[PDB]
Amino acid sequence: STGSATTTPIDSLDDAYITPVQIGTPAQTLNLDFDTGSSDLWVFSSETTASEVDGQTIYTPSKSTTAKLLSGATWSISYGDGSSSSGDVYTDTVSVGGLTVTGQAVESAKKVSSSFTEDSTIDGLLGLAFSTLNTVSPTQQKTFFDNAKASLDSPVFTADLGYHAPGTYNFGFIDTTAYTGSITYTAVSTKQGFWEWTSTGYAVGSGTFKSTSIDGIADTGTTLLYLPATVVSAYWAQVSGAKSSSSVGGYVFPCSATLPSFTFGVGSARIVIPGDYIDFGPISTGSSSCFGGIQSSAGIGINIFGDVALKAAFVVFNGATTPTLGFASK
Numbered sequence: 488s489t490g491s492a493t494t495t496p497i498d499s500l501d502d503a504y505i506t507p508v509q510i511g512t513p514a515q516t517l518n519l520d521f522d523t524g525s526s527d528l529w530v531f532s533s534e535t536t537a538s539e540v541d542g543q544t545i546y547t548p549s550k551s552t553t554a555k556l557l558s559g560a561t562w563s564i565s566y567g568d569g570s571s572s573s574g575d576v577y578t579d580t581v582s583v584g585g586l587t588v589t590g591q592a593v594e595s596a597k598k599v600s601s602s603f604t605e606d607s608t609i610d611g612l613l614g615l616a617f618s619t620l621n622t623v624s625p626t627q628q629k630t631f632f633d634n635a636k637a638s639l640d641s642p643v644f645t646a647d648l649g650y651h652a653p654g655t656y657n658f659g660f661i662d663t664t665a666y667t668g669s670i671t672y673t674a675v676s677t678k679q680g681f682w683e684w685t686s687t688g689y690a691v692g693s694g695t696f697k698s699t700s701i702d703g704i705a706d707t708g709t710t711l712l713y714l715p716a717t718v719v720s721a722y723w724a725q726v727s728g729a730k731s732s733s734s735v736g737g738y739v740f741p742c743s744a745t746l747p748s749f750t751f752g753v754g755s756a757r758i759v760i761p762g763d764y765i766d767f768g769p770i771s772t773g774s775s776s777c778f779g780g781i782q783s784s785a786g787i788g789i790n791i792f793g794d795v796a797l798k799a800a801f802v803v804f805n806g807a808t809t810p811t812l813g814f815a816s817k
């Protein structure tokens with residue numbers, strides 16, 4: 488089997504991407520944030536505290552003839568930005584772009600934190616990291632991809648995120664028309680439960696390539712590119728007027744600037760992020776200072792290849808017995 492679904496930026500800055508997902512019978516379509524950095528499929532629901540729902544589409548398990556309460560199962564997740572959500576668990580039929588999994592754990596939110604409430608465009612998350620990070624207790628549950636894997640033509644999914652435009656998530660096949668050149672594959676460590684890999688270096692604009700190992704995760708659920716302070720300083724040093732602002736929480740730059748590109752290495756291959764991809768617009772409405780798309784990971788403990796990087800590439804998440812990651816230009 489295979490599936491193919493369009494993923495769409497939620498706003499003009501590509502702050503996140505949403506992908507329609509069918510849950511239950513008859514289908515209830517929710518727009519989920521596919522997140523290769525986490526491992527729960529959780530949704531706004533009829534059980535979510537009313538005051539914490541503001542425009543989201545909800546899953547109502549009582550209206551699904553295939554929904555079954557998973558007795559005693561609960562979930563609770565907190566994230567690095569202080570956000571959180573929690574609730575109970577149903578099993579139900581879930582379909583993505585024509586690919587169907589029966590008996591998928593659908594984690595129904597009873598509580599969500601304000602940052603989720605405030606994002607009306609995102610109805611939940613679909614985690615695509617390894618199932619070892621799934622939070623359901625006392626019996627851990629599998630991700631949509633793990634559940635689908637055996638049925639897929641090939642045990643892979645691909646992320647093809649657009650810049651200021653829709654893109655595609657494919658399951659079970661590689662669309663050879665979706666990239667240029669070849670796909671370069673690189674080793675993955677699953678020890679921490681992430682798609683963790685090592686970039687071979689970087690360049691800023693037309694500058695010389697610096698060969699250096701940068702360990703990080705491929706994370707479609709993170710908007711920006713988070714890299715070591717040395718790398719980030721070298722990038723912003725090429726932008727007149729750019730500075731690290733403590734009050735704003737990162738590097739900012741004059742909105743009048745044209746940004747240099749940023750290149751990262753994948754083995755002997757190179758992915759080039761155009762400068763425009765690194766502009767995240769005014770720091771506050773009407774400001775002439777803009778927020779940078781490359782920020783320091785210094786306070787994280789890991790580097791994060793988020794959407795800013797991933798959208799410059801066609802990315803293969805290879806879930807074979809020994810997982811790997813592939814990157815192609817496009």
Ligand SMILES: Nc1ccc(CC(=O)N(Cc2ccc(N)cc2)C[C@H]2C[NH2+]CC=C(COC(=O)c3ccc(Br)cc3)C2)cc1
Pocket residue numbers: 522523524525526564565566567568569620621622706707708709713783784786787791
């Ligand atoms: N107290 C705390 C600290 C860290 C964590 C990891 C965490 O937040 N994780 C890993 C994880 C995986 C599985 C599960 N069951 C739970 C979490 C979520 C990731 C999911 N991807 C999208 C978004 C993410 C959130 O990033 C940020 O907050 C962030 C903040 C500052 C900077 Br500089 C860069 C990014 C990354 C969670 C809580």
Ligand SMILES: Nc1ccc(CC(=O)N(Cc2ccc(N)cc2)C[C@H]2C[NH2+]CC=C(CO)C2)cc1
Pocket residue numbers: 502503522525566568570606612708709710711
């Ligand atoms: N300082 C900071 C804050 C948050 C992060 C994570 C991150 O990237 N996001 C939050 C998040 C949290 C948890 C999950 N599981 C998925 C996404 C995405 C949001 C980033 N802010 C832009 C506006 C948004 C929506 O309008 C997108 C990174 C750095």
Ligand SMILES: O=C(O)c1ccc(Br)cc1
Pocket residue numbers: 524567568786787788789791
């Ligand atoms: O804020 C943090 O400490 C953090 C955020 C994301 C990830 Br992945 C790991 C750590």
Ligand SMILES: [Cl-]
Pocket residue numbers: 774775776
């Ligand atoms: Cl300002």
